[PDB]
């Protein structure tokens, strides 16, 4: 039963993830990005249930959903398994802010808290620094102060009737960690001409490896504790093969097909540490994915969000994401081999993630976020 709500919720994500991915890359050229396409779906499903007419049909098209009959069950399902668990520290947040001078539907700011978990909050938009600070604060309290300054006052005015803030944080513990004493600056090829030295983590990992010809890249999958979360790295065979890989990654299936060539092996991984903080304009991005009526006056038709079935549209939609990759993990701390540590020395084939790559967190069959690293 619930299999027809999840293996259906996985198909939508893959379409949206691949779409959200290309758009952010096209918005932040020549730089590192990180985004959570998955976390933006619930607010849209929450928004497709206030928006009526051609607005609803546009959102449902993009969300890859049939109707808002199943949209509620998909998110009411997703909303009953949304806390913590083993291996990683994922922090997904989403909220709608409607100008204080608005009368919303009292009953459905509950089907928002009891199906979407969120609440619809009124804030004095006329007070940019008071309204902007109040927003950054709920986002800063929801991410343990990991994501501060989500919105800026030069983006608000009481022209602004509504804003959609979205925050996602990630930092995980490997199934088997890297030693800090083993981290040193090693080469990284920013380009076929350039080569810099970056703090590169060295360590052996029991990973799932795959040489993918269709992408002209190498796919490695390193697992975090519990074996539910996995770091997906697709390294192009060419130093500059990244923008060419992005193109092939526009195929929502290129990943599933790449994960079937994936085999189990023990290799010495050489991974650079990396942090990425990306502030995405979901308005611009989503509007470039065929969802323009939501952020458009008189076309949005947010007559269910309100008690009065009145004039409303979205003014802003931000996404701030923060990934963090380091040596942190499991299996004690230093000369770490096995139970009783035999004094033997086993060397494994080396895999150097020494060129621009695409990554992604797979939290059990579903990529919760992704991006690309051009220079750590």
């Amino acid at each position: 039963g619930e299999t027809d709500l999840q293996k259906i919720l996985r198909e939508s994500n893959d379409q949206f993830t691949a779409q959200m991915f290309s758009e952010v890359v096209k918005a932040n050229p020549g730089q590192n990005v990180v985004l959570s396409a998955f976390s933006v779906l619930p607010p849209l499903g929450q928004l497709a249930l206030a928006s009526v007419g051609e607005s609803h049909d546009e959102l449902l098209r993009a969300l890859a959903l049939p109707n808002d009959n199943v949209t509620k069950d998909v998110f009411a399902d997703l909303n009953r398994g949304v806390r913590a668990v083993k291996g990683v520290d994922l922090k997904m947040a989403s909220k709608i802010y409607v100008a204080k001078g608005l009368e919303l539907n009292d009953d459905f700011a509950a089907v928002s808290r009891d199906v979407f978990g969120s609440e619809v909050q009124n804030v004095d938009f006329v007070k940019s620094v008071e309204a902007a600070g109040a927003i950054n604060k709920w986002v800063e309290d929801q991410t343990n102060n990991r994501i501060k300054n989500l919105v800026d006052p030069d983006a608000l005015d009481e022209t602004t009737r509504s804003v959609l803030v979205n925050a996602i944080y990630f930092k995980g513990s490997w199934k088997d960690k890297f030693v800090k004493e083993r981290t040193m600056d090693r080469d990284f090829h920013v380009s076929k001409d350039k080569t810099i030295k970056v703090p590169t983590m060295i360590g052996k990992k029991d990973v799932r490896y795959a040489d993918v010809p269709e992408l002209d890249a190498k796919m490695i999958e390193m697992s975090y504790e519990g074996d539910q979360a996995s770091m997906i790295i697709i390294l192009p065979n060419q130093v500059d093969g990244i923008t060419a890989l992005e193109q092939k990654l526009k195929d929502p299936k290129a990943l599933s097909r790449a994960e079937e060539r994936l085999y189990n092996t023990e290799v010495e991984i050489t991974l650079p540490k990396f942090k990425i903080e990306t502030t995405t304009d979901l308005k611009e991005v989503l509007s470039n994915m065929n969802i323009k009526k939501l952020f458009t006056p008189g076309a949005a038709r947010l007559e269910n969000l309100l008690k009065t079935k009145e004039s409303l549209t979205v003014d802003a939609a931000i996404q701030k994401a923060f990934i963090e990759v380091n040596e942190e993990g499991a299996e004690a701390a230093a000369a770490n081999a096995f139970g009783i540590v035999p004094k033997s020395l086993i060397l494994y084939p080396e895999v150097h993630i020494d060129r621009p790559f695409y990554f992604e967190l797979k939290i059990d069959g579903i990529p919760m976020f992704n991006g690309k690293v051009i220079e750590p």
């Binding site: 030693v179 000369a335 009783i340 004094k343 033997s344 020395l345 086993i346």
Partner: protein, 223 residues
């Protein structure tokens, strides 16, 4: 060897290197055609390297011989590391120079406090990794079985012996397995295991060779 010094060229002639495209373990030449090592260092293809000083370069004086026969103790357990001793018959007899010599087997089960020399090309960092070019030596005493068992409850048998320092700092590490623990000209131990390397309260556990003398003598003589 974590926390040791560099041995003088030729002071440890009995020390060999097990190789398979890279140094993975050590061993001891007990006669011109038999190397004694640890069982967990087993590999179906092993080339014994005698005469070695600097592992990462060919100085000209070395002797690379193939392990024709590789005999692990019948009772070697992979999970407890009991009976962690292996016999290697060299594909051909080796020249016994001042660079390649044979160690004598134990004539006595050495007492606690006996000063021993432990050598190898293994890791030199207790936390991290560092492979030495030249052989490393370490002067380490045999610890009381009482301190050995207290350091690892239920993990020590009558065939194991802890050699090292309880305060850590100086121990054997990854790559030294199978290696020599010579006390008064007699191979009393074989580098086996321990929790981490050079960690306080975690001395290195080695194979107590005085319990395999008959076995080492009987197997060789018969094969």
């Amino acid at each position: 060897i974590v926390g040791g010094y560099t041995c003088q060229e030729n002071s440890v002639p009995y020390q060999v290197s097990l190789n398979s495209g890279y140094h993975f373990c050590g061993g001891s030449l007990i006669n011109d055609q038999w190397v004694v090592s640890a069982a967990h260092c087993y590999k179906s293809r092993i080339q014994v390297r005698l005469g070695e000083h600097n592992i990462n370069v060919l100085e000209g004086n070395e002797q690379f011989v193939n392990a024709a026969k590789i005999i692990k103790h019948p009772n070697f357990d992979r999970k407890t590391l009991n009976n962690d001793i292996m016999l290697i018959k060299l594909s051909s007899p080796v020249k016994l120079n001042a660079r390649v010599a044979t160690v004598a087997l134990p004539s006595s089960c050495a007492p606690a406090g006996t000063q021993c020399l432990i050598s190898g090309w293994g890791n030199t960092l207790s936390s991290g990794v560092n492979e030495p070019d030249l052989l490393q030596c370490l002067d380490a005493p045999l610890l009381p079985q009482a301190d050995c068992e207290a350091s690892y409850p239920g993990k020590i048998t009558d065939n194991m012996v802890c050699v090292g320092f309880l305060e850590g700092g100086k121990d054997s590490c990854q790559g030294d397995a199978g290696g020599p623990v010579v006390c008064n000209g007699e191979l009393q131990g074989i580098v086996s295991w321990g929790y981490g390397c050079a960690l306080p309260d975690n001395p290195g556990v080695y194979t107590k060779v005085c319990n395999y003398v008959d076995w080492i003598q009987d197997t060789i003589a018969a094969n």
